[PDB]
Structure 1
């Protein structure tokens, strides 16, 4: 509850600051300043076509690691277990197979911007 008192505010501090930006400038919107930019010319294509990225494979290796990062995060509590020898090893096993998984891709030209 104490945080809702902080954060509904900041929406209003933003939402009250935007209504006083559209309804207090005296605008003159007609046709040719609303249309898109491309540096002083009429855009050839439609601005919403396939971009065809080139880091497509790295975006997935991130998509797999954000799990792996999440899969690390309980270590500050895991050290407060009584064993601290499986936590020792199994923390080496997770970080090692990652670097093995990272070094294989590093050599097989994964993070290299196909071109």
Structure 2
């Protein structure tokens, strides 16, 4: 069971907190541009995720031109990051 496996880890993690809790008795907007680019790149990663699991039944010649195409534009988005990104 996956449900039994996950819940056992969290319940033991909660118990460790109580041990320390119960027993003893006596600005800058330049960071934002980095965070946004993380999200926009990971969505291109999300489109490029199926590649090892997808390419099994589909035609290779039709895929080859389209598979590289996403990575090329992923570099063009980084090419726009070279024309003055900032001090970061």
TM-score of the superposed pair, with normalisation by structure 2: 0.83
Instruction: Kindly tell me the number of residue pairs found equivalent between the two proteins.
Output: 88
Aligned to 1:109: 84
How far residue 88 of structure 1 moved from its aligned partner, in angstroms, is 0.6
| Structure label with greater radius of gyration | 1
Structure 2: how far apart are the matches of 1:11 and 1:82?
Answer: 42
Query: Equivalent of 1:73, from 49, 65, 69?
Result: 49
1:27-42 correspondence to structure 2 within 5 Å: 27=26
Structure 2: how far apart are the matches of 1:112 and 1:88?
Answer: 38
How far residue 78 of structure 1 moved from its aligned partner, in angstroms, is 2.6
Is 1:60 equivalent to 2:36 in the alignment? yes
More helix by share: 2
* C-alpha spacing 1:75/1:83, structure 2 compared with 1 (3 Å): same
Point out 4+ residue stretches in structure 1 off by more than 3 angstroms: none
TM-score of the superposed pair, with normalisation by structure 1: 0.66
Aligned to 2:60: 84
- For structure 2, list consecutive stretches of 5 or more residues without a partner in the other structure: none
* 1:53-95 C-alpha deviation (Å, 9 max, x unpaired): 3232222121211111111111112311331112111011111
